[PDB]
Ligand binder design. Sequence first.
Ligand SMILES: C[C@@H]1COCCN1C1=N[C@H]2N(CC[C@@H](C(F)(F)F)N2Cc2cncc(Cl)c2)C(=O)C1
Length: 553
Amino acid sequence: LKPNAATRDQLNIIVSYPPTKQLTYEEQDLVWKFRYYLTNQEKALTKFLKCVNWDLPQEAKQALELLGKWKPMDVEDSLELLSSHYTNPTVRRYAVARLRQADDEDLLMYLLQLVQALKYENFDDIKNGLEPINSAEIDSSQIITSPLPNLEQDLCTFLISRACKNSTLANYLYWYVIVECEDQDTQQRDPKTHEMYLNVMRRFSQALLKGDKSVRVMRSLLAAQQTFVDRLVHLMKAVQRESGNRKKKNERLQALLGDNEKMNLSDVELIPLPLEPQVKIRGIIPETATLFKSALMPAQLFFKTEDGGKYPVIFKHGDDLRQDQLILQIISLMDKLLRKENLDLKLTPYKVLATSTKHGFMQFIQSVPVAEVLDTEGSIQNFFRKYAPSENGPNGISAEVMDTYVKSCAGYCVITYILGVGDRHLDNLLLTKTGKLFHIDFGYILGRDPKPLPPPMKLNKEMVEGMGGTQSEQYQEFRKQCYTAFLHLRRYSNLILNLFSLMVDANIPDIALEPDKTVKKVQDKFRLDLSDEEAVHYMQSLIDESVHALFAA
Ligand SMILES: C[C@@H]1COCCN1C1=N[C@H]2N(CC[C@@H](C(F)(F)F)N2Cc2cncc(Cl)c2)C(=O)C1
């Protein structure tokens, strides 16, 4: 029953191993023996469930008795029980029971991954949920637009249940499920999975229709959004087909946008913007809409908002926004995590929402790429002097602007390092007149890069020069903020890792390459082998080596 002191210490070693580390057969044999003692340790549960062979009915049965008797697990820990690693129905109900304890604010932080977790759920239990054919004959983008006249819930039931009580959650659940239906690789390689997402959508549609006055209206709005996107897509196809230069294309873009009788995109009743449903839109301003220099022909569009505002967006048609959608979702979570630890590092986690595997939205943040900053003002400090001057301020620039700059440089240095962001150049490093420095274009992630031998630390001459060099007080503050952000993010390793673990079968280019090796790629950047004091030095070493190497050119 109770182990000795030396054994109690041996078990403690195991309980606090990283998630990618595999327990040995004898290691598990020990944990299995003292499973009743381990009951008082919530962090032991994870290690315990890794000892069970769910193909052995009595072992599974034995384990589930202990699950009900175990110390209730964390909401961050419950995300591990929804991964592909656990498919036993009761285990997955336990995970959901722990999510029933979370706020919608947190549920929203994990919803991208939760929608993905439906792939490991029971497809029949989801089908038998439909109250009273070829799957290709059922258009996903037509379900909501064609309305017909303790451990009780599974994941599907739960997500819909909460989506009816909350309009924001419903908007994302809808679009996250819409893109999972629209996935052509899933349709072709796993037809039974594609059928499931359709059944989740029909269940959601049905659930709304059975709801009250406010719930029933959510279904109309969702259908109004679908319809708007559908028409924006048709407008895009048209402009991309239009023969001529960018000038002739923009003429056609604004021409069609101006034609509300034909297109219905310039004047509409207030509908939640798919990208940020907290924002209601009146339609697109035609005259301000144009195409970017890019060969894809993406469009910058100005949405008239509920309160006279103008919300710029990038609408890409002919591209998959899911990888950028994941990266921006992680940067947002990491920013929220740092703020929770009272460390606001002036980050720019703009919104990205793929509305299909072929099209999506992006929240446009007014800025100038550092490339252009140099092409016109010659330096980051010259640019900041122009738009943000102060006589008493450091290097003849405002304190707030200088402070925001150092803070975001440090924030992004750590995040881009942890997420292993490749293809870094001055075209995708953006700067704001408030001092906000941020990265865009997440086409190369988790150590992937177009060029061979990419550096682990994405830092350059211009960035350091903008700080007033290596001997500045600012440079010292930069270092201090890097290693602080790092220790804070390392604290939330389990969560960042469990979420990435739920993206292995998501069809994210750079995750698909090595799904098995993905979690470890991230897990290694945290350097969980090192103590906080060691980590601080490891970070300072990265910075030194990086800076020395960049001046050596
Ligand atoms: C929404 C965010 C944040 O706000 C800023 C823009 N932005 C992005 N811009 C972007 N891009 C891919 C390349 C091109 C595009 F989309 F046209 F194909 N550019 C335009 C672009 C490129 N370089 C500088 C600027 Cl300001 C603008 C992004 O993945 C994100």
